[PDB]
Amino acid sequence: QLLPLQKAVRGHVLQFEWHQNSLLTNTHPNFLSKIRNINVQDALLTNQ
Amino acid sequence: VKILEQIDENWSKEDLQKLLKGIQEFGADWYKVAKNVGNKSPEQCILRFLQLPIEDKFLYSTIAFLVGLVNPKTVQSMTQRAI
Amino acid sequence: NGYSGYGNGITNTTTRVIPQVEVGNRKHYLEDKLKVYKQAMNETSEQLVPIRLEFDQDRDRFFLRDTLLWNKNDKLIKIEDFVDDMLRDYRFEDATREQHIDTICQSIQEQIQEFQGNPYIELNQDRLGGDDLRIRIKLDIVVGQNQLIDQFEWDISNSDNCPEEFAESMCQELELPGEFVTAIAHSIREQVHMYHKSLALLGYNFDGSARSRMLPTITLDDVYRPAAESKIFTPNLLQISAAEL
Amino acid sequence: NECIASTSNALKVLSGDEGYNEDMVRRANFYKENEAMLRENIEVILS
Amino acid sequence: PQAHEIVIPSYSKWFNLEKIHSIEVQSLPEFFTNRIPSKTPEVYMRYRNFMVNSYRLNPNEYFSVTTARRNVSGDAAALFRLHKFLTKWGLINYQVDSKLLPKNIEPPLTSQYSTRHDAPRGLFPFESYKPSVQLPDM
Amino acid sequence: EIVIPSYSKWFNLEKIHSIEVQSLPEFFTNRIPSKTPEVYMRYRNFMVNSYRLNPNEYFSVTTARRNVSGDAAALFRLHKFLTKWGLINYQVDSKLLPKNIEPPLTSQYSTRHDAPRGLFPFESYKPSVQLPDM
Amino acid sequence: ELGAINLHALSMSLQSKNLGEINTALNTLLVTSADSNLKISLVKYPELLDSLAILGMNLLSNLSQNVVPYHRNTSDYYYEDAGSNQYYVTQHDKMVDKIFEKVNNNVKQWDLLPEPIRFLPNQFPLKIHRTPYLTSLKKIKDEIDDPFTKINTRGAEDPKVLINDQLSTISMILRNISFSDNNSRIMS
């Protein structure tokens, strides 16, 4: 008669720990690859 | 058939006896049940209780290794069912 | 959901960035310890330093009459930072110019710059339990509302004995709670130091008797246990009084 | 075996996802695992 | 006696007033090379438990390192080091201030637990047709 | 006359055990004139007989400071020593130091961002089993 | 997205448990991604960078050593006791214990914070991976769908991919942090 209870709380803690193994492998956002070109500042900085 | 639960070590028979007795008519109040047993940490009770088999239901396959999903069935997939 | 990262915190706001809201007031320091600490204090440790602090005199307005210890073998702390932490701990007016800290660190390094720890008595000499010359240490302190005075033999020549043990032992009085014992050892390390420090100015840190004031300031052989009215200076007393200091 | 399981997994991922298809067989994943203990501990503190 | 409600930033839930942890040694190793005999894990733990008790007593109001320095010492330097350390780890002087909120409500609430699609462990929402009964069951 | 720790039943109130000199060498450099096995004998015998007088009540060390004006260093040391061998203070359960505190045991935890306190799953149900009726 | 305010998550990141590391790392990554108004200032930040590099070093290390962290049977992994001490023991009297010990029967070095970097024994230099951008198609061929993708596009059912994606995320967030003044904070 207790079994479903243990199953339930088991699922609780299971989903909980499983949540840890989630590190946005799910998605693949852009990571601000801003520098399309290196701007003027880069070149003139090199020279300077 | 004839499922025995007097099967644990490092906890006496009466240990789990009092454990289940509490959780029976105490509704998962881990503090109560810990009080209601002989000097085991509440989390200890939770863990042990969590490792309590029901060794008479899981039967040893295609379904025995897959659930909420399955190979389709219009072709000769039963080849799988004879794995 | 909930709100907690910094003291019951707030995690539900207008979605901004907040750097280290931890200050009791200007209280967050952990930056820049890891490498330096590891590389530094993985090696031997050595003598400590008693320090007194007086700034209340009628040249500046303070309650600076506290003592504390220090390791001259340390180079991990911007001393001024420690001072300011102490001052903010003293709840003083945040303006630490009228609460000038420079003067304080000046006095600090001044005091530290007259020290050698114990002499070759520790640096190169090693006499089992020291040799002799137990100073009649005289210690009085004023804590809370009560003062306490005592005098007793305590060797200068021995290193094997540290002060704090005497402290925790004489703790066995009424309660001598906490705050007391520290200053005692401090005074202790104060009291002893100067003597051999002054003796360091001479040259007996190896040999026996010195050269003129060390003669009256000594214990003797004491071949037999004493009388009751002389050692009647050793005992201790706890007395309430209106303060006039 | 592998292609079958992969097909199933693809079915699932192309849809909602669940962490564990199994471990109703408690004995295995709990005698042979203990991070359960620590994670639990973390839980009960709040729960 | 106990008379207050003491909370801690959970991630700290590795500290135990009883024992020590690899964390702090990697952050305060100067009591563990066993080089300076006047220092030892033991006196460390003494200081540690003393200070945490002190704070937990009246945690509503702050506690200073200078306080302990007055109270007990074997050093100022290490005392300050560890004090500020525990400060960082909030074990001390964490509940110095209090903050409150009326917390209006939203469709999700902690007492809400109904039947709905589930990410957790297995469940079967469709049981059996008629001819399933056609089995010489157990 | 009075029983002591059984293992300690070896003392010489009239002699010096090699255990003593081995434990504490400082009285045997034959260099300190102010110190000698004799004055240590007097030290220890006075101490232990004094405690023997009313061992029903504890005896501290500061007393010795009052009573011999020797170096409190060795006094404290030997006192600790004799207690370690139970030769002194074997009938008492008191004389401890204060912190005006005791270790508490209550605690709470909250570090909410989203992940702990649950990653907030969907709701569920099913506490109790049911009947097939088939 | 939103919520997600504080900076001091570093503390939890500094902590050595899988849980906290996930909780922070993922969040703070999403944070540094956002730039509409979201930037990581510098006041008493640096601790962040330290923690980060330390984490990455240790993880990559025991990865190269092919051993999973976060889960052992040891814990609180050094001394635990309440022995004979008030505050100051282990002076002369300690040898009495030896004496005591001899009659009742009737120092260390400490490593630095990070591990070494090279000279690691298992890791011995053998030429691999000097291949050009071509591998993209390899990538395609790798990422190509096949009955054996072995791309557990889901979470860590095994810890190996866990460590992998961990380091990946760390690299990404490190990149995103590096687009402003406070390059000086990162400056060598």
PDB file of N, CA and C in Angstrom, chain E residues 2 6-11 13 17 53 110 112-118 121, chain F residues 99 101-111 117 120 122-126:
ATOM      1  N   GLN E   2      17.761  27.203  22.596  1.00  0.00           N
ATOM      2  CA  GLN E   2      17.674  27.708  21.235  1.00  0.00           C
ATOM      3  C   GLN E   2      16.524  28.692  21.131  1.00  0.00           C
ATOM      4  N   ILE E   6      17.743  30.213  12.158  1.00  0.00           N
ATOM      5  CA  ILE E   6      19.025  30.451  11.517  1.00  0.00           C
ATOM      6  C   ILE E   6      19.019  29.801  10.146  1.00  0.00           C
ATOM      7  N   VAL E   7      19.206  30.616   9.118  1.00  0.00           N
ATOM      8  CA  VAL E   7      19.259  30.148   7.746  1.00  0.00           C
ATOM      9  C   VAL E   7      20.654  30.421   7.207  1.00  0.00           C
ATOM     10  N   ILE E   8      21.013  29.683   6.163  1.00  0.00           N
ATOM     11  CA  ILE E   8      22.317  29.849   5.528  1.00  0.00           C
ATOM     12  C   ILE E   8      22.161  29.699   4.029  1.00  0.00           C
ATOM     13  N   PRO E   9      22.979  30.422   3.271  1.00  0.00           N
ATOM     14  CA  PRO E   9      22.993  30.228   1.819  1.00  0.00           C
ATOM     15  C   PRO E   9      23.387  28.802   1.474  1.00  0.00           C
ATOM     16  N   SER E  10      22.427  28.073   0.898  1.00  0.00           N
ATOM     17  CA  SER E  10      22.452  26.613   0.887  1.00  0.00           C
ATOM     18  C   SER E  10      23.792  26.057   0.438  1.00  0.00           C
ATOM     19  N   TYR E  11      24.353  26.589  -0.646  1.00  0.00           N
ATOM     20  CA  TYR E  11      25.585  26.037  -1.198  1.00  0.00           C
ATOM     21  C   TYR E  11      26.617  25.769  -0.118  1.00  0.00           C
ATOM     22  N   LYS E  13      25.932  24.311   2.365  1.00  0.00           N
ATOM     23  CA  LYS E  13      25.519  23.079   3.033  1.00  0.00           C
ATOM     24  C   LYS E  13      26.529  22.009   2.651  1.00  0.00           C
ATOM     25  N   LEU E  17      29.577  21.894  11.866  1.00  0.00           N
ATOM     26  CA  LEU E  17      30.209  22.321  13.106  1.00  0.00           C
ATOM     27  C   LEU E  17      31.007  21.215  13.759  1.00  0.00           C
ATOM     28  N   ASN E  53      29.222  29.889  16.748  1.00  0.00           N
ATOM     29  CA  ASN E  53      28.277  29.952  17.851  1.00  0.00           C
ATOM     30  C   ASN E  53      27.991  31.394  18.216  1.00  0.00           C
ATOM     31  N   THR E 110       2.884  26.876  -4.643  1.00  0.00           N
ATOM     32  CA  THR E 110       3.504  25.696  -4.057  1.00  0.00           C
ATOM     33  C   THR E 110       2.492  24.616  -3.702  1.00  0.00           C
ATOM     34  N   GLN E 112       0.089  23.547  -5.591  1.00  0.00           N
ATOM     35  CA  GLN E 112      -0.566  23.195  -6.843  1.00  0.00           C
ATOM     36  C   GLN E 112       0.101  21.961  -7.439  1.00  0.00           C
ATOM     37  N   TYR E 113      -0.643  20.852  -7.489  1.00  0.00           N
ATOM     38  CA  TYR E 113      -0.108  19.546  -7.892  1.00  0.00           C
ATOM     39  C   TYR E 113      -1.266  18.729  -8.474  1.00  0.00           C
ATOM     40  N   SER E 114      -1.413  18.777  -9.794  1.00  0.00           N
ATOM     41  CA  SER E 114      -2.544  18.162 -10.477  1.00  0.00           C
ATOM     42  C   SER E 114      -2.055  17.165 -11.521  1.00  0.00           C
ATOM     43  N   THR E 115      -3.005  16.599 -12.259  1.00  0.00           N
ATOM     44  CA  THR E 115      -2.728  15.591 -13.270  1.00  0.00           C
ATOM     45  C   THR E 115      -2.539  16.270 -14.617  1.00  0.00           C
ATOM     46  N   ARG E 116      -1.406  15.994 -15.254  1.00  0.00           N
ATOM     47  CA  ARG E 116      -0.906  16.749 -16.391  1.00  0.00           C
ATOM     48  C   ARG E 116       0.328  16.024 -16.907  1.00  0.00           C
ATOM     49  N   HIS E 117       0.690  16.310 -18.158  1.00  0.00           N
ATOM     50  CA  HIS E 117       1.882  15.736 -18.769  1.00  0.00           C
ATOM     51  C   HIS E 117       3.075  15.819 -17.834  1.00  0.00           C
ATOM     52  N   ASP E 118       3.889  14.769 -17.845  1.00  0.00           N
ATOM     53  CA  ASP E 118       4.921  14.587 -16.839  1.00  0.00           C
ATOM     54  C   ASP E 118       6.252  14.260 -17.496  1.00  0.00           C
ATOM     55  N   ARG E 121       9.627   9.940 -14.104  1.00  0.00           N
ATOM     56  CA  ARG E 121       9.592   8.495 -14.280  1.00  0.00           C
ATOM     57  C   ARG E 121       8.271   7.989 -14.835  1.00  0.00           C
TER      58      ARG E 121
ATOM     59  N   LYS F  99      32.499  29.991  27.621  1.00  0.00           N
ATOM     60  CA  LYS F  99      32.296  30.802  26.429  1.00  0.00           C
ATOM     61  C   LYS F  99      30.920  31.443  26.458  1.00  0.00           C
ATOM     62  N   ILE F 101      28.265  30.085  25.970  1.00  0.00           N
ATOM     63  CA  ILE F 101      27.572  29.534  24.812  1.00  0.00           C
ATOM     64  C   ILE F 101      27.510  28.019  24.945  1.00  0.00           C
ATOM     65  N   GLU F 102      26.781  27.400  24.022  1.00  0.00           N
ATOM     66  CA  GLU F 102      26.763  25.966  23.791  1.00  0.00           C
ATOM     67  C   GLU F 102      26.446  25.763  22.319  1.00  0.00           C
ATOM     68  N   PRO F 103      26.907  24.674  21.714  1.00  0.00           N
ATOM     69  CA  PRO F 103      26.691  24.470  20.272  1.00  0.00           C
ATOM     70  C   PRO F 103      25.222  24.265  19.949  1.00  0.00           C
ATOM     71  N   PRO F 104      24.625  25.153  19.161  1.00  0.00           N
ATOM     72  CA  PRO F 104      23.223  24.983  18.769  1.00  0.00           C
ATOM     73  C   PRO F 104      23.083  23.952  17.656  1.00  0.00           C
ATOM     74  N   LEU F 105      21.828  23.634  17.337  1.00  0.00           N
ATOM     75  CA  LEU F 105      21.562  22.549  16.404  1.00  0.00           C
ATOM     76  C   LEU F 105      20.507  22.883  15.358  1.00  0.00           C
ATOM     77  N   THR F 106      19.872  24.044  15.425  1.00  0.00           N
ATOM     78  CA  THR F 106      18.812  24.399  14.498  1.00  0.00           C
ATOM     79  C   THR F 106      19.407  25.038  13.254  1.00  0.00           C
ATOM     80  N   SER F 107      18.779  24.807  12.104  1.00  0.00           N
ATOM     81  CA  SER F 107      19.312  25.374  10.873  1.00  0.00           C
ATOM     82  C   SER F 107      18.229  25.475   9.814  1.00  0.00           C
ATOM     83  N   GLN F 108      18.479  26.337   8.831  1.00  0.00           N
ATOM     84  CA  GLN F 108      17.618  26.501   7.671  1.00  0.00           C
ATOM     85  C   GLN F 108      18.476  26.805   6.456  1.00  0.00           C
ATOM     86  N   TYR F 109      17.886  26.638   5.275  1.00  0.00           N
ATOM     87  CA  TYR F 109      18.624  26.794   4.029  1.00  0.00           C
ATOM     88  C   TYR F 109      17.737  27.422   2.975  1.00  0.00           C
ATOM     89  N   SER F 110      18.306  28.352   2.218  1.00  0.00           N
ATOM     90  CA  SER F 110      17.605  28.931   1.081  1.00  0.00           C
ATOM     91  C   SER F 110      18.639  29.580   0.179  1.00  0.00           C
ATOM     92  N   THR F 111      18.858  29.002  -0.995  1.00  0.00           N
ATOM     93  CA  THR F 111      19.617  29.677  -2.047  1.00  0.00           C
ATOM     94  C   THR F 111      18.852  29.450  -3.343  1.00  0.00           C
ATOM     95  N   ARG F 117      15.460  23.696  -4.748  1.00  0.00           N
ATOM     96  CA  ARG F 117      14.053  23.753  -4.351  1.00  0.00           C
ATOM     97  C   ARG F 117      13.204  23.152  -5.465  1.00  0.00           C
ATOM     98  N   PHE F 120      11.387  22.910 -10.626  1.00  0.00           N
ATOM     99  CA  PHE F 120      10.002  23.231 -10.945  1.00  0.00           C
ATOM    100  C   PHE F 120       9.476  22.325 -12.048  1.00  0.00           C
ATOM    101  N   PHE F 122       6.496  19.944 -13.879  1.00  0.00           N
ATOM    102  CA  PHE F 122       5.048  19.969 -13.961  1.00  0.00           C
ATOM    103  C   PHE F 122       4.459  19.243 -12.760  1.00  0.00           C
ATOM    104  N   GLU F 123       3.170  19.453 -12.547  1.00  0.00           N
ATOM    105  CA  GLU F 123       2.500  18.792 -11.448  1.00  0.00           C
ATOM    106  C   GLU F 123       2.223  17.335 -11.788  1.00  0.00           C
ATOM    107  N   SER F 124       1.895  16.568 -10.757  1.00  0.00           N
ATOM    108  CA  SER F 124       1.569  15.161 -10.902  1.00  0.00           C
ATOM    109  C   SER F 124       0.561  14.807  -9.823  1.00  0.00           C
ATOM    110  N   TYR F 125       0.422  13.508  -9.569  1.00  0.00           N
ATOM    111  CA  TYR F 125      -0.575  13.014  -8.627  1.00  0.00           C
ATOM    112  C   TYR F 125      -0.203  11.578  -8.256  1.00  0.00           C
ATOM    113  N   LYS F 126      -1.212  10.769  -7.924  1.00  0.00           N
ATOM    114  CA  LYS F 126      -1.148   9.323  -7.720  1.00  0.00           C
ATOM    115  C   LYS F 126      -0.427   8.911  -6.445  1.00  0.00           C
TER     116      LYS F 126
END
